[PDB]
Swiss-Prot record:
Specifically expressed in immune and hematopoietic cells. Expressed in bone marrow and blood cells. Levels vary considerably within this compartment. Present in at least 74% of immature CD34+ cells, whereas within the more mature population of CD33+ cells, it is present in only 10% of cells. Present in the majority of T-cells, while it is present in a minority of B-cells (at protein level). The chain holds residues 398 to 857 of 1189 of the full protein. It comes from the Eukaryota. It is found in: Cytoplasm; Cell membrane; Membrane raft; Cytoplasm, Cytoskeleton. Changing residue 288 to E: In one patient with acute myeloid leukemya; somatic mutation. The gene is INPP5D. It comes from Homo sapiens. Belongs to the inositol 1,4,5-trisphosphate 5-phosphatase family. This is Phosphatidylinositol 3,4,5-trisphosphate 5-phosphatase 1.
Length: 460
């Protein structure tokens, strides 16, 4: 039975509005409704992994697991296995997988982050799950961010707190936050970004939605505008939105948006908005293709509609050679030439690099670089030809060309990372000097760049 080189992943996000679901929710898992929908000819084909994020979920874990498993069994005639379930207040994540994957999945982690302080601590935050699927690390975050049209900055702050403090994946990757720990990271939820248009324009917005004319609305979507200004979700991707706003509906129909201010809304307007979103970030040159992104039309218990997204995702096998794991393979090496970091810091300490990768027996620390001044004010840290030669555990190019090197640039004075990035070993050539590049981030914000050349030797 061969190991897969691709899997499909279903991501669902639904703010349930504190109401039990209706008796049938299969359209959600079938990617049917509005937007980029899944072909009817695929309806009986199970996804490999289903990741369900809820917000304002009134159900017990047991109650929701029984609904989800029975739903998928009706669709697919497969009894899915529960990989993980984690709940913070009314924010929940469930991961289900086909039974054949049970002995491909390991290192299952769960965590949560509570956002805000005092007042603003008590119902918003995130839950997450990570695990290994054979050689590939997968992370999943379901977040319920701060509500309200005039709180986009709070939402951006909630995002940074979640990516700093959510403790998922390999703890040995100590300089790296969740935005670097996974081959594939999916971040979804009721992110609560709004369409930023004047209140007086509510009926005009509704008109546009009825005409399926979303362009003048998406140009005011706060998540797209904040992302384009690099204020949030730097280096994540989202599929084009081709479904109507998923909030705020009158319950028990989808014929009406309920936008007007009420005591129950704190006298706030809720103009129609794309509150409910799926984003991803995968390591460079790994296969990931969004195959659906849309909303259901027939699940009407909540003031939100469920959102679905599905992905093809490249995976790798758990590789064994006669040498590594458990030793190095002398026929492999990774060399860095002419490398330098460009940092935005105003500080003057010496810096060194750390190289982390599951192709190495353990992480590698470089010598200190030589600091110079860039022509436009910047700090440039030069490593020249001084970086250590990296010794992979396995030299076979079918393994090594699928790997990645995480890089942290650390202060010699404090051993704190000033920037993190990732280099793919999926090169155009071996035994050939080739340019490499990564942006560097810290707490998910841009802090600099790392560039130079690589030379990769494999057994071929
Ligand atoms: C919002 C809207 C448009 C863009 S254009 C750049 C798109 N990507 C994103 C991440 O991958 C590289 C570039 C970005 C944010």
């Amino acid at each position: 039975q061969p190991e897969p080189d691709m899997i499909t992943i279903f991501i669902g996000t639904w703010n349930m509005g504190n109401a039990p679901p209706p008796k049938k929710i299969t359209s959600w898992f079938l990617s049917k409704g509005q937007g980029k929908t899944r072909d009817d000819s695929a309806d009986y084909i199970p996804h490999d992994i289903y990741v369900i994020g809820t917000q304002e979920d009134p159900l017990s874990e047991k109650e929701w697991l029984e609904i989800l498993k029975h739903s998928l069994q009706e669709i697919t005639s497969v009894t899915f296995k529960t990989v993980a379930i984690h709940t913070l207040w009314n924010i929940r994540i469930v991961v289900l997988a086909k039974p054949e994957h049970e002995n491909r999945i390991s290192h299952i982690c769960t965590d949560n982050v509570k956002t805000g302080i005092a007042n603003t601590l008590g119902n918003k935050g995130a839950v997450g799950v990570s695990f290994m699927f054979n050689g590939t690390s997968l992370g999943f975050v379901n977040s319920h961010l701060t509500s309200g049209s005039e709180k986009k900055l709070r939402r951006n702050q909630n995002y940074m707190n979640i990516l700093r403090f959510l403790a998922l994946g390999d703890k040995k990757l100590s300089p790296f936050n969740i935005t670097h720990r996974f081959t594939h990271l999916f971040w979804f939820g009721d992110l609560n970004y709004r369409v930023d248009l004047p209140t007086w324009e509510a009926e005009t917005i509704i008109q546009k939605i009825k005409q399926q004319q979303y362009a003048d609305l998406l140009s005011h979507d706060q998540l797209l505008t904040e992302r384009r200004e690099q204020k949030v979700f730097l280096h994540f991707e989202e599929e084009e939105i081709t479904f109507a706003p998923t909030y705020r509906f009158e319950r028990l129909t989808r014929d009406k948006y309920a936008y007007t201010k009420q005591k129950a809304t704190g006298m706030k307007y809720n103009l129609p908005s794309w509150c409910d979103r799926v984003l991803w970030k995968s390591y460079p040159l790994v296969h990931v293709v969004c195959q659906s992104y849309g909303s259901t039309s027939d699940i009407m218990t909540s003031d939100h509609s469920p959102v679905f997204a599905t992905f093809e995702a490249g995976v790798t096998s758990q590789f064994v050679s006669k040498n590594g794991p458990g030793t190095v393979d002398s026929q492999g090496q990774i060399e860095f030439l002419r490398c330098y970091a460009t940092l935005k810091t105003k500080s003057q300490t010496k810096f060194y690099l750390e190289f982390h990768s599951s192709c190495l027996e353990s992480f590698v620390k470089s010598q200190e670089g030589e600091n110079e001044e860039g022509s436009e004010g910047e700090l440039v840290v030069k490593f020249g030809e001084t970086l250590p030669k990296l010794k992979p555990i396995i030299s076979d190019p079918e393994y090594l060309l699928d790997q990645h090197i995480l890089i942290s640039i650390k202060s010699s004075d404090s051993d704190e990372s000033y920037g993190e990035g990732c280099i793919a070993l999926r090169l155009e050539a071996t035994e050939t000097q080739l340019p490499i590049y990564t942006p560097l981030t810290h707490h998910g914000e841009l802090t600099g760049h790392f560039q130079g050349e690589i030379k990769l030797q494999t057994s071929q």
